[PDB]
From TrEMBL, chains A, B:
Keywords, comma-separated and alphabetical: Cell membrane, Membrane, Transmembrane, Transmembrane helix
Cellular component GO terms held in the UniProt record: plasma membrane
The protein's name: PomB
Entry's family note: Belongs to the MotB family.
Intracellular or extracellular location(s): Cell membrane
Length: 149, 149
């Protein structure tokens, strides 16, 4: 945890601006560091296309954690509205592909180990808030990078 | 526990022939039932398309567990051969999409709850066998359904 506890501050202070804007949130959850990445600015709505101006943030996260032992679990989330897409078969598909986009970007950082990654699509199974508002749904549509000891 | 032993034996029953034909493997893993389904006869090589003959087997599994508490985690796996298709960006993509196909099929069973599903792409991170022969690599390309109380 010492090793992790330092990493968390290293992360918080390396991304202090993104955190200010509300683009990144960093939480401790047991022996686990969770980095939530707001949808807005990272992915177009209804798309797993990781936006150019966000890719360096993702690599920056990869660089920051490349030296700690532990699984890096990348999890895509959607809100509860049915997906009307020509591109994705379901919210499973969309949420999965978002995680894939992020994992793929992370493993481009030299020294970042491919073997530690795991990609998950959670669809709407883990809301942060009830999907009772537009702001709430957007919030639930985050992607999370979890650093697990 | 007790309802997890009946479940396991029950599945062994209903899937007798598939098991004998090596199409499916079922075993305990701590507090959890793992069903492994080989690539051959379930997915075309290099594709996430769930093949027709296998769709009923997937729904059968979903029938079997629909009344048991707990998460159903569907996990796709590849061998360690870097893939080159234009359909999938990486083994994360292909492994994820296969889990997606199986999850979508399962949730078509009435009374099987969408909320209990989780989808994972594991790429080559969890081999069953050393990746040192065609037969071994093939066996690593399974999809697993884990029933976790």
């Amino acid at each position: 945890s010492q090793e992790m506890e330092t990493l968390m501050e290293s992360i918080k202070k390396a991304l202090e601006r993104e955190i200010e804007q509300g683009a990144i949130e960093v939480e401790n959850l047991g022996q686990q560091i969770v980095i939530r990445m707001r949808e807005k600015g990272a992915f177009p709505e209804g798309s797993a296309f990781l936006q150019p101006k966000f890719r360096p943030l993702v690599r920056q996260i990869a660089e920051l954690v490349k030296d700690v032992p532990g699984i890096v679990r990348v999890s895509g989330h959607t809100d509860n509205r049915p997906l009307d897409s020509e591109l994705y078969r379901s919210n499973w598909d969309l949420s999965s592909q978002r995680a894939v986009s992020v994992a793929q970007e992370m493993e481009k950082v030299r020294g970042f180990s491919h073997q530690r990654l795991r990609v998950r699509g959670m669809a709407d199974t883990e809301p942060l808030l009830p999907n009772d508002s537009d702001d709430n749904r957007a919030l639930n549509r985050r992607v999370e990078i979890s650093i697990m000891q």
